[PDB]
Design a protein around this ligand. Structure first.
Ligand SMILES: CC(C)(C)c1ccc(C(=O)Nc2ccccc2C(=O)Nc2ccc(C(=O)O)cc2)cc1
Lengths: 224, 13
């Protein structure tokens, strides 16, 4: 259908905050021209992960109605969404980087991370590509992931639900406009989130194989 | 306290 005036306001707010996304030229130049080693590659990944969290915190705080929620809840939502948001955000790097991806992919495959973890996540990046999601879709999807009622340790789940549902309605409308031909597009995006949820177990296993780590990463990931 | 860094970042600006 067509977005309501309130819905239009919500999308722009999400769009403005999301498009503040940054990739320090410093991180970009490391992947392209840097010591190609398992140790060096792992370090680059950590820097990117740390950078994402800083971006993620800014996007999360700016989220409409996020400031309303309980302070414990805000941390709980932020802690809950970190792995899923990071993988989705990393997935979005088909549009953003072009040469670099081959280097980035190789560095990721040589990080010393086990092969089993690599296949599913890369499959996800390839799988996510099929959707050919717009930037607006990525922003709405990330916000929905962040604003999850289901997250552990939430004192007031219902309050989180109200914020999340408006996003879903907006995202659903976007699918029709962006992809009028496919009526199953909204369902497909939701399905990916289910595939996204898998990574927390996968991410948790990766953590267990010690390799480093940044102070910000440790708090969010509950390291030690 | 626990999660001081996250709270500080959240309460930023
Ligand atoms: C070696 C071990 C498995 C313990 C490991 C290796 C790398 C890391 C890490 O810092 N990042 C990743 C590790 C494994 C698989 C994927 C990643 C990853 O995608 N990091 C990442 C997150 C967000 C962004 C971004 O959106 O800017 C970029 C990279 C953590 C643990």
């Amino acid at each position: 259908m067509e977005l309501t005036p309130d819905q239009q306001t919500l999308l722009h707010f999400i769009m403005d905050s999301y498009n503040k996304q940054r990739m320090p030229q410093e991180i970009t130049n490391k992947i392209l021209k840097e010591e190609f080693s398992a140790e060096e590659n792992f370090l680059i990944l950590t820097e990117m992960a740390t950078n994402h969290v800083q971006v993620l915190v800014e996007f999360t705080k700016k989220l409409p109605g996020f400031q309303t929620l309980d302070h414990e809840d805000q941390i709980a939502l932020l802690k809950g969404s970190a792995v899923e948001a990071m993988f989705l955000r990393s997935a979005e790097i088909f549009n953003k980087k072009l040469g670099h991806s081959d280097l980035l992919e190789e560095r990721i495959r040589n990080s010393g991370i086990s092969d089993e973890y690599i296949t599913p996540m890369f499959s996800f990046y390839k799988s996510i590509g099929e959707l050919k999601m717009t930037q607006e879709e990525y922003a709405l999807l990330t916000a929905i992931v962040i604003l999850s009622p289901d997250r552990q340790y939430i004192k007031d789940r219902e309050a989180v639900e109200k914020l999340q549902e408006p996003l879903l309605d907006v995202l659903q409308k976007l699918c029709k406009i962006h992809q009028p031909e496919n009526p199953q597009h909204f369902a497909c995006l939701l399905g990916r989130l289910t595939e996204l949820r898998t990574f927390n177990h996968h991410h948790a296993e990766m953590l267990m194989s010690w390799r480093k780590f940044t102070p910000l990463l440790c708090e969010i990931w509950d390291v030690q | 306290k626990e999660n001081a860094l996250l709270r500080y970042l959240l309460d930023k600006d």
